[PDB]
Design an enzyme around this catalytic site. Structure first.
Site, PDB file in Angstrom:
ATOM      1  N   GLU A 156      15.373   1.607 -11.450  1.00  0.00           N
ATOM      2  CA  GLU A 156      15.204   0.138 -10.898  1.00  0.00           C
ATOM      3  C   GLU A 156      16.745  -0.439 -10.990  1.00  0.00           C
ATOM      4  OE1 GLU A 156      15.666  -2.925 -12.349  1.00  0.00           O
ATOM      5  OE2 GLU A 156      15.250  -4.189 -10.534  1.00  0.00           O
ATOM      6  N   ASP A 200       6.750  -7.449 -13.861  1.00  0.00           N
ATOM      7  CA  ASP A 200       8.434  -7.166 -14.598  1.00  0.00           C
ATOM      8  C   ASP A 200       8.447  -8.305 -15.301  1.00  0.00           C
ATOM      9  OD1 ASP A 200      10.945  -6.063 -14.620  1.00  0.00           O
ATOM     10  OD2 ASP A 200      11.573  -6.515 -12.662  1.00  0.00           O
TER      11      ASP A 200
HETATM   12  C1  LIG Z   1      14.371  -7.939 -12.736  1.00  0.00           C
HETATM   13 AS1  LIG Z   1      15.116  -6.571 -13.304  1.00  0.00          AS
HETATM   14  C2  LIG Z   1      13.873  -5.065 -13.606  1.00  0.00           C
HETATM   15  O1  LIG Z   1      16.115  -6.201 -11.788  1.00  0.00           O
HETATM   16  O2  LIG Z   1      15.944  -6.735 -14.726  1.00  0.00           O
HETATM   17 ZN   LIG Z   2      16.314  -5.438 -15.934  1.00  0.00          ZN
END
Ligand SMILES: C[As](C)(=O)[O-]
Ligand SMILES: [Zn+2]
Length: 313
Positions: A156, A200
């Protein structure tokens, strides 16, 4: 309080009683709290830990990897999403998702383990699957037409904060992969996702959640109602106000995250992310000691009730 489709009280207390806080903390959360940047040994070890843990559930989940190599600012890097589908033959599923990688920091920095981001989300999914394992197993054995799917996405985080394509490696790949794979009735695995709930930035004290998608606000309202209910039942800790987490309105939006590739393909999304972000976000202080354990277990209880009501467990 008792709304249509809510668990009867005695059913709710038994569901909550199946949760094990020590198991969540020690068996599911602690092993994740390692550096786990894409391609690292630690990331591979966490991948294998997730896989093995999921395979061990007595309900007999279908657990598969989505491994691939992508270009990154650091050159080719391998990624691997962990995809757990309880009943691969069911028509559709509730999908709960999170990311298991940790953001890469410069060498010489205090190591970043992303406790809220997203070790706690990952651990919550494991604990839910375990706590509800007997119920999930029976639902599968009855051929329920809506099953459960858990996605642990890799990559991610940006590797070098190097523009918009240095992010979402795993979710971009998996959404594209799922669109290419037939499913019945489908027609592809994308359409099998009845709801995509992305967890998240969980585990800090005082999180606030807003509904980011009018399409799925009914589920946001359900989570709020569950919070209120658990509060009034004396089942939340360190929770002095009846509603603290699930707030009305939308003062802060959604941010880019692993739901985007799914959202863009028509999947309904609920984005369960604290906004504002944890104070520790994207600093090496995002660690176990800065988590707020009562909040972690409160979220776990809210989610367990949600899952049991959604799936009729
Ligand atoms: C909100 As994130 C998983 O991009 O730090
Ligand atoms: Zn992050």
């Amino acid at each position: 309080v008792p709304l249509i489709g809510s668990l009867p009280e005695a059913r709710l207390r038994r569901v909550v009683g199946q949760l094990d806080p020590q198991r969540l903390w020690s068996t599911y959360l602690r092993p994740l709290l390692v550096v786990r940047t894409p391609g690292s040994p630690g990331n591979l070890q966490v991948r294998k830990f997730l896989e093995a843990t999921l395979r061990s559930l007595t309900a007999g989940w279908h657990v598969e990897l989505d491994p691939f190599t992508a270009s990154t600012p650091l050159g080719p890097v391998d990624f691997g999403n962990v995809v757990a589908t309880l009943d691969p033959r069911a028509a559709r599923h509730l999908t709960l998702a999170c990311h298991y990688d940790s953001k890469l920091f410069p060498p010489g920095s205090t190591p970043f383990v992303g406790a809220t981001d997203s070790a706690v989300p990952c651990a919550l999914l494991l604990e839910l699957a375990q706590a509800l394992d007997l119920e999930l197993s029976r639902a599968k054995k009855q051929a329920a037409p809506v099953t459960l799917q858990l996605l642990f996405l890799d990559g991610e985080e940006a590797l070098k904060e190097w523009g918009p394509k240095d992010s979402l490696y795993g979710s971009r790949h998996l959404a594209q992969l799922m669109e290419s794979i037939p499913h019945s009735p489908g027609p592809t695995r994308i359409q099998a996702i009845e709801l995509f709930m992305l967890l998240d930035l969980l585990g800090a004290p005082n999180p606030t959640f807003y509904s980011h998608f009018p399409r799925t606000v009914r589920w946001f309202h359900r989570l709020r109602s569950i919070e209120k209910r658990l509060h009034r039942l004396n089942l939340l800790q360190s929770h002095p106000q009846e509603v603290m987490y699930f707030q009305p309105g939308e003062p802060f939006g959604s941010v880019e995250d692993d739901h985007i590739p799914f959202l863009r393909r028509g999947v309904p999304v609920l984005h369960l992310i604290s906004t504002p972000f944890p104070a520790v976000w994207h600093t090496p202080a995002d660690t176990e000691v800065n988590l707020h354990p009562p909040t972690v277990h409160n979220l776990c209880r809210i989610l367990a009730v949600f899952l049991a009501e959604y799936l009729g467990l």
